[PDB]
Amino acid sequence: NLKDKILGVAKELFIKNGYNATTTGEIVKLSESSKGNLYYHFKTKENLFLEILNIEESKWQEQWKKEQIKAKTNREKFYLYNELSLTTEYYYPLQNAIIEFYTEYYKTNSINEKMNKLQNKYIDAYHVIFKEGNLNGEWSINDVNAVSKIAANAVNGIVTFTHEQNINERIKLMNKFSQIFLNGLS
Amino acid sequence: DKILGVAKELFIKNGYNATTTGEIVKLSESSKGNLYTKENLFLEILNIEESKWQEQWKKEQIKAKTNREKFYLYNELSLTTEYYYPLQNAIIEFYTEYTNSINEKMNKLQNKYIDAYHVIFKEGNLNGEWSINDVNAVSKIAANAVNGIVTFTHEQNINERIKLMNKFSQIFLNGLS
Ligand SMILES: Cc1cc(N)c2ccccc2[n+]1CCCCCCCCCC[n+]1c(C)cc(N)c2ccccc21
Numbered sequence: 001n002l003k004d005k006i007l008g009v010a011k012e013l014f015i016k017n018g019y020n021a022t023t024t025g026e027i028v029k030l031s032e033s034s035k036g037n038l039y040y041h042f043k044t045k046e047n048l049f050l051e052i053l054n055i056e057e058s059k060w061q062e063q064w065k066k067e068q069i070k071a072k073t074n075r076e077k078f079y080l081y082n083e084l085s086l087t088t089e090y091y092y093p094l095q096n097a098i099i100e101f102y103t104e105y106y107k108t109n110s111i112n113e114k115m116n117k118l119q120n121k122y123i124d125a126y127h128v129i130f131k132e133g134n135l136n137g138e139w140s141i142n143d144v145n146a147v148s149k150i151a152a153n154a155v156n157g158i159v160t161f162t163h164e165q166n167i168n169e170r171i172k173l174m175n176k177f178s179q180i181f182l183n184g185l186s
Numbered sequence: 187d188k189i190l191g192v193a194k195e196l197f198i199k200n201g202y203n204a205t206t207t208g209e210i211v212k213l214s215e216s217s218k219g220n221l222y223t224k225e226n227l228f229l230e231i232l233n234i235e236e237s238k239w240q241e242q243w244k245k246e247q248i249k250a251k252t253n254r255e256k257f258y259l260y261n262e263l264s265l266t267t268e269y270y271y272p273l274q275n276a277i278i279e280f281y282t283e284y285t286n287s288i289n290e291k292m293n294k295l296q297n298k299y300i301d302a303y304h305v306i307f308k309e310g311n312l313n314g315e316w317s318i319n320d321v322n323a324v325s326k327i328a329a330n331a332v333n334g335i336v337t338f339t340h341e342q343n344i345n346e347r348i349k350l351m352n353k354f355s356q357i358f359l360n361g362l363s
Pocket residue numbers: 053056057059060085088089092098099102103115118119275278337338339340
């Protein structure tokens with residue numbers, strides 16, 4: 001459990017102090033491990049952080065599997081996912097370390113390579129909703145990959161660039177977007 | 187205006203946090219006291235750039251005959267400009283790493299950003315292209331959705347991005363009518 005202890009501790013350090021401030025020395029000593037083991041498993045602070053994000057994305061997917069039973073039809077699932085995306089981000093503790101992380105390794109094509117495989121996972125959630133929505137005549141989309149990328153990124157924008165407003169208004173808007181968007185697929 | 191140019195460049199190349207008071211003065215070659223907050227300098231640049239965009243938009247919107255077309259175009263152009271949108275990641279940090287006199291003050295910057303759509307949508311209501319009772323909501327949603335597509339895909343074929351943005355604009359408008 002040394003690999004999973006290191007990630008657990010590193011998660012909490014990144015949460016408490018951000019990405020740049022947290023050193024690998026800290027993570028080593030606090031998880032009772034060695035620079036060696038940390039190097040053998042993750043090679044860099046950068047890659048360790050990506051691995052956390054993998055664990056976190058998996059937990060999110062696992063969360064979404066349970067939570068999407070409260071949505072009988074894919075139209076309902078679309079509405080719900082976008083809400084969840086907005087509401088849960090408001091108190092996602094890693095979010096700040098993520099902002100800090102991305103806005104620092106976006107240029108390195110390899111790190112930006114793995115960060116894309118990660119967003120692709122977020123985009124898969126919509127892809128499913130839309131594919132299944134087709135197979136139940138909720139709508140007709142011949143370009144599911146496209147409309148999926150659009151939804152994911154439209155929704156991130158509404159989640160990220162609003163913040164200023166109070167949480168009720170932000171939920172109203174998000175749901176209004178969800179409405180407008182699904183109406184344009186008809 | 188010796189500072190502001192290098193600050194922009196620095197803020198765009200590296201983060202809001204990563205670029206510094208020292209780095210700004212030393213790289214621009216100017217007096218430390220001369221520029222005496224960082225948040226004040228930042229909010230200044232955002233205003234400048236946001237104006238340079240809305241100005242460029244006015245000298246370019248003429249090529250769209252109907253407001254339906256203005257929507258598509260403004261959004262398409264949002265991908266190509268050198269103004270404002272290249273500072274979006276820097277703004278994301280800004281909110282996290284930042285009060286009262288500033289955090290409420292830069293909602294006047296947001297309303298300027300949203301106003302572009304407010305015209306387009308209000309104009310379209312006069313022109314009878316659609317009917318939006320909740321213009322202001324739709325404007326805020328439009329602005330942010332688009333900013334999303336612009337910002338969270340800045341690492342892929344620019345011509346693909348323009349395709350996505352157009353498939354977006356279509357859907358959004360189709361859902362208004
Ligand atoms: C657990 C968990 C819990 C949640 N409530 C949650 C909520 C929403 C999404 C994931 C969530 N997860 C899953 C967490 C996984 C996060 C993985 C995202 C890594 C890529 C970063 C996204 N990103 C991209 C793409 C492009 C950018 N320009 C950019 C700029 C600034 C900041 C981010 C940027």
